[PDB]
């Protein structure tokens, strides 16, 4: 259960696909208005490998649908996304998701 | 609601913000009317 | 419960000198149009992103406040319910954003055109992207003072700003009926960009601290015409023949003697001979406005009371200037009128006169559907030059006081 | 309901023709804040 939007074109040929690195320097938001996570604050490319789940599956699916150079906005179900306990300290339980998440190469 | 600073002395109902807002499709055809108003009062003089 | 804190950019709004209302009155036409051009680069420069809208404001914004606001920082136009506004991808009312559809569904980016819309009659604010229209409008204002062209951007912009005939080149056709924008200016200087609500400004001192300052209103901008002794009603054509004398005076200057056909460029004139002599529309033409104005004078407020009588006829002419005659015989000749100083209100009752003059014409060409279109504003609003030649015309008119 | 408050003045501004009649800005700025969540001033 996951809606993605376009905001800006990227190059709409070139996606991510398995055993690929992925670079993510992406903002993170709470769906009431509030942002409790950003990569561009710490100034560091968040990067991560697809297939061996070492991130959220809703975010994994989510960026399997864009292209290189695209920025879009995402919306994660809670019941993709730390269903019931959540994590603790951070988000409350059963919370809907936003992400602003923009791809900068390597597919 | 808490965006609202109308401070004025002659008051009437008559000076409420009030803005409506319509969405409809391509076609033309009407989609949703939302109203938004900064206020939502009804007047006591209006049942006695 | 607790007090979260965060780190939020700065905003400014810019907006024309430009002032356009709908009111009883000249209210111009209730459509407008423009376009603007934009080709910034720079989405995340500096962690937040780069905001940029353009809008519609009325004039009680007071938004800019730089600093602190209500949701996140002093945010820019769109965010109340005093400014109307876009951004390529949602309608901002009150804070709150809806997303909007259109073919390229992306926000402002570099080498794009927007267009907006105004028709105060539905009052309606409709959005146009480059080519295509934007599916959605806004209704039931509430419209009340006046309107502003706003803009919105955080920095490293350099927008240009399209306005119409004075430079702007407009790349599209505006819809059927919209004037270009370029017309609406007060009539008493030049158009220049300023921002609104500023309180400090640069200087060669340095910082200058500036107050509140001043604007119209829908009132303002609505002109209004204002609402028997025998020698009342005796000298009529004497002040009018006084008055008659200066028909010819410039118009000898002029060289238009008696011209039988009415040669509106080639120098003529076909009312320049005594009033039986005259046309049937020439006798009222010089006594109905004046015998009226004379009528309304005493609703002017003024102490006058004809109790001359110095000999009746020593108000003398001054003629002979060469042969300054003409097939009729007028010979123009103003009459002793000259040596009448005023008094310190009539310095002010001649133009409290002229502001009704110019008041009443406006009434009348308001009439016929605002002079049927194809350029006359309300009095001590109007431009410079109006103002000179109707104090003159009047003077003479006014000069008898003392006479008769 | 009072028409008065006591606002700071921040120690630097936004510092700022031609064909078009183009804006002119270069550097940015930036400030710290707090959202008092009860009403939501900022």
Same mark, same amino acid.
């Given at each position: 259960g996951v809606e993605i939007e376009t905001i800006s074109p990227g190059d709409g040929r070139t996606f991510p696909k398995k055993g690929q690195t992925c670079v993510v320097h992406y903002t993170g938001m709470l769906?009431?208005?509030?942002?409790?996570?950003?990569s561009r604050d710490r100034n560091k490319p968040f990067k991560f490998r697809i297939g061996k789940q070492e991130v959220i599956k809703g975010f994994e699916e989510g960026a399997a649908q864009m292209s290189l150079g695209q920025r879009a906005k995402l919306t994660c179900t809670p019941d993709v996304a730390?269903?019931?306990?959540?994590?603790?300290?951070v988000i409350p339980p059963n919370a809907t998701l936003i992400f602003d998440v923009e791809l900068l190469n390597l597919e | 609601t808490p965006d609202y600073h109308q401070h004025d002395m002659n008051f009437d109902l008559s000076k409420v913000r009030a803005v409506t807002v319509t969405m409809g499709d391509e076609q033309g055809n009407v989609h949703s009317s939302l109203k938004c108003s900064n206020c939502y009062m009804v007047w006591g003089g209006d049942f006695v | 419960l607790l007090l979260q804190t965060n780190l939020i950019n700065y905003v400014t709004s810019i907006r024309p000198n430009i002032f356009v209302g709908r009111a009883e009155g000249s209210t111009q036409y209730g459509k407008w149009y423009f376009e603007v051009m934009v080709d910034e680069v720079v989405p995340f420069l500096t962690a937040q992103a780069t905001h940029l809208r353009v809008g519609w404001a009325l004039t009680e914004g007071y938004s800019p406040y730089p600093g602190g606001g209500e949701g996140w920082g002093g945010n820019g136009v769109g965010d109340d319910l005093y400014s109307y506004g876009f951004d390529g991808l949602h309608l901002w009312t009150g804070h709150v954003a809806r997303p909007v559809t259109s073919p390229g569904q992306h926000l402002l980016a570099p080498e794009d055109v927007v267009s907006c819309c105004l028709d105060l009659s539905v009052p309606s604010i409709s959005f146009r992207i480059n080519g295509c229209p934007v599916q959605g409008v806004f209704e039931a204002f509430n419209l009340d003072g006046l309107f502003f062209p706003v803009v919105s951007f955080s920095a490293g912009v350099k927008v240009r700003f399209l306005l119409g005939g004075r430079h702007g080149e407009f790349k599209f056709l505006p819809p059927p009926g919209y004037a270009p924008c370029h017309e609406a200016v007060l009539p008493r200087e030049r158009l220049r960009l300023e921002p609104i609500k500023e309180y400090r400004r640069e200087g060669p001192r340095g910082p200058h601290l500036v107050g509140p300052s001043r604007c119209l209103s829908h009132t303002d901008f609505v002109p209004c015409p204002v609402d028997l002794p025998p020698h009342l009603e005796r000298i009529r054509e004497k002040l009018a023949e006084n008055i008659?004398?200066?028909?010819?005076?410039?118009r000898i200057e002029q060289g238009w003697t008696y011209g039988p056909v009415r040669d509106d460029n080639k120098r003529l004139h076909?009312?320049?001979?005594?009033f039986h002599s005259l046309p049937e529309p020439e006798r009222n033409y010089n006594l109905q406005m004046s015998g009226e104005t004379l009528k309304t004078l005493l609703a002017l407020g003024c102490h006058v009371? %004809?109790? +001359?009588?110095?000999?009746? +006829?020593?108000?003398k002419k001054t003629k002979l200037?060469?042969?300054? %005659? %003409?097939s009729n015989g007028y010979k123009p000749a103003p009459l002793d009128l000259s040596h009448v100083r005023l008094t310190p209100a009539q310095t002010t009752l001649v133009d409290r006169l002229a502001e009704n003059g110019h008041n009443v014409w406006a009434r009348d060409r308001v009439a016929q559907g605002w002079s049927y279109s194809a350029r006359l504003v309300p009095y001590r609003l109007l431009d410079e030059a109006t103002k000179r030649s109707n104090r003159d015309s009047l003077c003479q008119a006014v000069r008898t006081l003392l006479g008769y | 309901l009072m028409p008065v408050s006591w606002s700071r003045m921040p120690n630097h501004f936004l510092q700022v023709e031609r064909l078009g009649w183009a804006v002119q800005c270069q550097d940015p700025l930036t400030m710290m804040a707090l959202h008092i969540p009860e009403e939501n001033r900022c």
């Open positions: 769906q009431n208005g509030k942002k409790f996570d950003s730390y269903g019931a306990t959540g994590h603790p300290g | - | 008659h004398e200066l028909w010819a005076l410039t076909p009312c320049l001979v005594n009371g %004809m109790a +001359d009588e110095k000999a009746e +006829d020593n108000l200037p060469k042969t300054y %005659m %003409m | -």
